[PDB]
């Protein structure tokens, strides 16, 4: 069964590119990472930093999670990310996304030993 740490890598890590390389990136990646299987995931963020750098955020500034949990951490540096947002024209199973590049601090919830991101909470 997929671990929470491996789910976070599948849903939110793309160290392969430094930024979204085209206007189709979210359409391709949302489908490729299985985020459009049973419905269109409405929003999702991909992080274009090394797995090591994103895992290190769990050692950085501790902040509250949006759901009230207190095991979230905010990256000390901005990171290259891509925000994926379903378009008004998207109809499952033909899910369609707007791709927007950003450079923002990320906030993740961390769990486990090793203590690693298991949830992407926000970017600021």
């Amino acid at each position: 069964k997929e671990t929470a740490a491996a789910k976070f890598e599948r849903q939110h890590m793309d160290s392969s590119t430094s930024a979204a390389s085209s206007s189709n990136y979210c359409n391709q990646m949302m489908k490729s990472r299985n985020l459009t299987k049973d419905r269109c995931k409405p929003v999702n963020t991909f992080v274009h930093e090394s797995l090591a750098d994103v895992q290190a955020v769990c050692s950085q500034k501790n902040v509250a999670c949006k759901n009230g949990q207190t095991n979230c951490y905010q990256s000390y540096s901005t990171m290259s990310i891509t925000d994926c947002r379903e378009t008004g024209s998207s109809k499952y199973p033909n899910c369609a996304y707007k791709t927007t590049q950003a450079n923002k601090h990320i906030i993740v919830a961390c769990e486990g030993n090793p203590y690693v991101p298991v949830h992407f909470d926000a970017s600021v």
Partner: nanobody
Amino acid sequence: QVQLVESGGGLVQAGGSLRLSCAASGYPWTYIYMGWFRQAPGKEREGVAAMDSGGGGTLYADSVKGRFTISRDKGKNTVYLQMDSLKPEDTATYYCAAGGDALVATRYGRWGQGTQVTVSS
């Protein structure tokens, strides 16, 4: 990286008291939650008490509620456990934990090496 320096463990008889102390060193920000966990020989590790860096939001394990009192220096990465009315069932290694959520061990990222507490009959 960060060190959680623990002190205050010892050996006492049932009914006695002990005080555990923990200070996190080298963290540039403030751990919102810090707390105490314990692990007895053969048993699963369990949350004992936790609280937020403002001095509130205290949480206690059902078995220590009324006997143990957690405190912190407000706004600082310290946490303390006053342990009174000690029972043999409280014998365990006690661990400070920093940067986590409620008493959910897997949600805490920094752990001390542990301080042994032994309560005799």
